[PDB]
Amino acid sequence: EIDYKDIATLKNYITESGKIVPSRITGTRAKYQRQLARAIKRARYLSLLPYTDRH
Amino acid sequence: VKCKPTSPGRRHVVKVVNPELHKGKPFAPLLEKNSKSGGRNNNGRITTRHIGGGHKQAYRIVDFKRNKDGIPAVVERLEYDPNRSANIALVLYKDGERRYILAPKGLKAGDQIQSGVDAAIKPGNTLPMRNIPVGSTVHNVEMKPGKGGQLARSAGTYVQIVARDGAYVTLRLRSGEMRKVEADCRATLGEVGNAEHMLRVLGKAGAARWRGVRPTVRGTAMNPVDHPHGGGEGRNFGKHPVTPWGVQTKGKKTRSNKRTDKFIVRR
Amino acid sequence: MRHYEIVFMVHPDQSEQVPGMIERYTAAITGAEGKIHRLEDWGRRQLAYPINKLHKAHYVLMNVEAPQEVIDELETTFRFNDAVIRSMVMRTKHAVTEAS
Amino acid sequence: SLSTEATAKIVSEFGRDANDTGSTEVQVALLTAQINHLQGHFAEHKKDHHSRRGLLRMVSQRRKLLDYLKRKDVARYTRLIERLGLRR
Amino acid sequence: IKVRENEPFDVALRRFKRSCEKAGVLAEVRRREFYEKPTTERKRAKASAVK
RNA sequence: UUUUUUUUUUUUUUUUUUUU
RNA sequence: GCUUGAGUCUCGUAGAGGGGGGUAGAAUUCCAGGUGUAGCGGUGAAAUGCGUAGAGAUCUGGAGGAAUACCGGUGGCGAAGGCGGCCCCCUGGACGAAGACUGACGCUCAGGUGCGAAAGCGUGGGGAGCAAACAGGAUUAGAUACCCUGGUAGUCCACGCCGUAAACGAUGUCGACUUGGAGGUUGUGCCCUUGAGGCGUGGCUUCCGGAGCUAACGCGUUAAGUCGACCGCCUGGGGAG
RNA sequence: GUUUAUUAAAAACACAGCACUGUGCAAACACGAAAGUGGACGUAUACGGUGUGACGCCUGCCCGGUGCCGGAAGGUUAAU
């Protein structure tokens, strides 16, 4: 979650509205949470996380 | 003229604020390679170009074409031209030759001045545009493919390359963005040398215009023996056109050789 | 030495020219003493948006221990390549030695 | 921001006996040398207000430090300006 | 935002795009936008809804 | 946070004294 | 002689960065040719244009104009103003730290030094989309008008005299203040790290706790209750900016 | 100032900037019957229209008529 490899396993944390879910479902720890926030960013712009259905 | 080095005018202790206070670009002698222009209007006989005043024409800088591209060179000094406002340099070609090239704002060190087909890209003698990259600045541009450059000054006149335009047929300038002159014509770079000599008035009058020509000053006004007006009495006050030929909008062309102007947005 | 992360996208089908082009782009990096964590053939992937009329590129991804001294001579030699669809760069927060 | 070929000599020639490496005379000699070091690359970057402050800063403290050594230790102060000047 | 219907009686299986990208994208723009004043209003709205 | 179904309708003189 | 006010080095660190460089992408104009028969806009009710010289549209092919959409926040920076894409260089402020070395080199300020929202002067222009002015048809008790197509300036600004208003603890300099606990937050010491943070601790922010003090809304220790160095401003109606 | 020597002696106005205008260029002008010589050894910030009225601001405003021309949805009706 610091880096790309586990965020390809964590594609379930995405809503039917196509985006990265609010954590209330499970309440993530603010450290473990903040790490994934940067790995999402780099993956979003390369497209290794293909943002929503069409793309 | 926000620019530098600017030379701003004087504090009013003489009749003159302008002229241009540019120290460091007049020089003497007229070096070995020089020529002149001659007589007065003299067209054979009854000259149509009005007012004349034709004494001191006088001399001009001699180097046209400048087609030596590949042979590298360096900058000796830079001057001025009273016929164009032009910032020209004296250029020593490392082969054995001295020449006069048209320059941008301060091009010295004596830099690395060279051209050649895809071999080079720097501000360079004359240089073909289908072998170098795309910008605002280009400069020399053969007015058609082998004839001679369009612009003999670095007065400000940006001609602006377009990339791949209808297969090499390029540029984007002022009064006709459908020149379609092919990029097989020669560049050099680039269009701001001395804007300071032109962007501001040198005087009201100045040496630039009264030592060897008279400019125009009338046509319409006084003595009814030349123009389509009129009686007397100080009056004027009619319809008086520039006849038989026109003034304020109409156009003049219909047919020519090459003729490349197409869309024409005008205004 | 900025541990840059850089993608680019050639025409999808020039598969004989991309390997002679991969030698030719590491060339810049190696001629500068820069080192390569990874250099991934991504492949012929299809597109998010309508760019260049073949509906696909052929991508590459790489991770370089290299200085600012080359990043424009790459941005240059991409942008003058008449067959390169798109390219971008990201920097630091370590390298990535493991593939995508 | 200068070379260790410079810091390591500043140290020796403005220190006393041992561990003077951060005292008032070795501090003046390091500021003085660093100010003068910066003069030899400042002509570049051309819009550089973002760095010219922390330089202005160090060369205003250079003046202050000196006028402070005067009030504290006159016969250090004098000896130090006999070698380097900086009196401005 | 690309939805398949199938054996087409007109199925209305297109319903679920109301979730955001069809619709909730208009909380700024209507002919015109709001323009002035909505930006703390965005968090003004939370102190209305605590029950 | 879209809030124009018309715009306007002269002055007075009302006032049951006061200290608490 | 000290409490170390104050600094420099040293070691570490993250975002919408003071000023030059680069540039990832919807719509939708108008045209080059592909087509379909006549009606698109727009409204309280529709208009002046337009339509057997075919009302848009919508593909295909071209030419121009260079918004920052959003991991975007149920928020982050910042002296304010004030950007939001990420980034090359110059690298504001930081400011969390083992230490190292000198001893108040210290606070806080007038006229001044700079910065300086709205605006004039601009000098040459960069000249999308909207909409004061600009242009009209309309609804007319006069519309000197809102629409509604057209519409600039404002978008920003190289450079630069910029005073300046609404930037209200209706309010600066701050040191002790140690009944305190309650959140929003955030760098962080210690745990079999079995954990949804338990034992803790400084900061950036708010919740609202006595004795006092005390009109009525109550304010309740850093806060107006004691206590202090001024660089002020405070001369009552109308004189006034 | 010395410029209309010839009524005035300037109480004439030659400055000079510019929005606009004629040339994408065998450029505008053609004087000579054949010149391409002014402009040119040069490009629409070169040279010319018509002027400008120090400098610096300021050009509000308003399209009836009448000009300047441009165009084509469309009729007056031609060499074709």
Asked if B20 and B196 touch (Cβ cutoff 8 Å), the reply is yes
The 3 state secondary structure assigned to chain B is: CCCCCCCCCCCCCCCCCCCCCCCCCCCCCCCCCCEECCCCCCCCCCCCCCCCCCCCCCEECCCCCCCCCCCCEEEEEECCCCCCCCCEEEEEECCCEEEEEECCCCCCCCCCCCCCCCCCCCCCCCEECCCCCCCCCCCCCECCCCCCECCCCCECCCCCCCCCCCCCECCCCCCCCCCCCECCCEECCCCECCHHHCCCCCCCCCCCCCCCCCCCCCCCCCCCCCCCCCCCCCCCCCCCCCCCCCCCCCCCCCCCCCCCCCCCCCC
State how beta strands B73-78 and B127-128 pair: unpaired
Structure-block tokens of residue B163 = 């990339």
Could you tell me if C95 lies within 8 Å of chain A, comparing CB atoms? no
Report yes or no: B84 and B194 within 8 Å, Cβ to Cβ: no
The type of residue at B15 is K
Cross-chain Cβ contact A42/C5 below 8 Å: yes
- Please give the backbone phi and psi of residue C61, each rounded to the nearest 5 degrees, phi first: -130, 140
Ordered by start, the domain boundaries in chain E are 1-51
With beta carbons less than 8 A apart as the criterion, state whether B127 and B70 touch: no
Residue C47's Cα: distance from chain center in Å?
17
Cis amide linkage into residue D8, ω under 30° from 0: no
Asked if the C-beta of A55 comes within 8 angstroms of chain C's C-beta atoms, the answer is yes
CA distance B191 to B136: 9
The Cα–Cα gap between B267 and B255 comes to 22
Residue C4 DSSP class: E
- In angstroms, the CA B118 to CA C99 distance is 39
Show residues of chain A in contact with E1, CB under 8 Å. Answer: 53-54
Tell me the β-bridge partners of C38: C63
Residue with tokens 């895809």: B118
**Chain H, protein-covered positions (CB within 7 A):** 14-17, 20-32, 35, 37-52, 54-55, 67-70
| CB-proximal positions of chain G, under 7 Å | 7-9, 14-15, 17-20, 22-26, 61, 63-64, 70-72, 74-75, 86-93, 100-106, 122-124, 158-159, 186-187, 196
Instruction: Compute and round to an integer the Cα radius of gyration of chain B.
Output: 22
| Residue E49 β-bridge partners | none
Task: Determine the straight-line distance between the first and last CA of chain B, rounded to whole angstroms.
Answer: 27
Alpha helices by DSSP H, chain D: 4-14, 24-38, 49-72, 74-84
Q: Do chains C and A touch (3 or more CB pairs under 8 A)?
A: yes
Write the CA distances from B132 to B24, B183, B196, D23, D37, integer angstroms: 34, 10, 29, 60, 41
**Can you give the resolution of this entry in Å?**
9.0
**Phi, psi dihedrals of residue B89, rounded to the nearest 5°:** -110, 160
Exposed e or buried b per residue across C38-59, where buried means at least 16 C-beta atoms within 10 angstroms of its C-beta: eeeebeeeebeeeebeeebbbb
DSSP SS3 for D51? helix
Closest residue by Cα to residue C10 from C47, C60, C48:
C60
Both tokens of residue B52? 């004349």
Distance CA B197, CA B71 (A): 32
- Other Cβ atoms closer than 10 A to E27: 10
Q: Do E1 and A16 touch (CB under 8 A)?
A: no
Which residue type does D69 have? L
Q: Determine the Cα–Cα distance for residues B150 and B65; give it in Å rounded to an integer.
A: 11
Residue entry with tokens 């309508």: C50
Q: What's the rounded Cα separation, in Å, for the pair C61 and B41?
A: 71
Coil, strand or helix: which one is C10? strand
Residues of C in contact with A5 (CB under 8 A): 98
Residue matched to tokens 């479902």: A25
| C97 touching A (Cβ < 8 Å) | no
> What residues does C64 pair with on adjacent strands?
C4, C36
Nearest by Cα to C44 from C12, C19, C10, C18 = C12
Q: How far apart are CA C31 and CA B94, in angstroms?
A: 31
Cβ-contact C14, C63 below 8 angstroms? no
Can you read off the two tokens belonging to residue B187?
């560049």
Contact C89, C21 (CB under 8 A): no
Residue type (1 letter), B59: Y
Are B263 and B178 in contact by the 8 Å Cβ rule? The answer is: yes
E37 CB and strand F closer than 7 A: yes
The SS3 of residue D20 is coil
Non-local (6+) Cβ contacts of B130 within 8 A are B168, B182, B183, B184
Rounded, the Å distance between the CA of E40 and C1' of G183 is: 22
SS3 C36: strand
Alpha carbon of E21: minimum distance to chain A alpha carbons (Å): 8
Q: At what angle do helices D24-38 and D49-72 cross, to 10 degrees?
A: 150
Whose C1' is closest to the CA of B46: which nucleotide? H31
Q: Which residue is nearest to nucleotide H66 (CA to C1')?
A: B239
Q: Whole-angstrom Cα distance, residue B191 to residue C92?
A: 41
In this structure, what token pair is assigned to residue B139? 């400069």
Phi, psi of B153 (to 5 degrees): -145, 155
C31-34: long-range contacts (C-beta < 8 A, 24 or more apart)?
C32/C66, C32/C67, C32/C69, C32/C70, C34/C1, C34/C64, C34/C65, C34/C66, C34/C67, C34/C70
Cα B200 from Cα D76, distance rounded (Å) = 60
CA B134 and chain centroid, separation: 23
**Beta B59-60 vs B35-36: how paired, if at all?**
antiparallel
Residues, chain C, total?
100
Separation CA B102–CA B140 (nearest Å): 8
- Please write down the long-range contacts of B249-258, taking CB distance under 8 Å and 24 or more positions apart: B258/B144
- Contact partners, residue B90, CB within 8 Å, separation at least 6: B31, B75, B76, B77, B78, B79, B98, B99, B100
Residue B235 CB closer than 7 angstroms to strand H?
no
**Other residues' Cβ atoms within 10 Å of the Cβ of residue D71:** 8
C1 in reach of chain A (CB within 8 A): no
CA B228 → C1' H36, Å?
Answer: 30
The CA distance from E51 to E42, in Å, is 18
- Provide the experimental method for this PDB entry: cryo-EM
Query: Residue B227 has which token pair?
Result: 């123009």
Length of chain D: 88
**Which chain C residue has the Cα nearest residue A41?**
C90
| N residues, chain B | 267
Rg for chain A (alpha carbons), in Å? 11
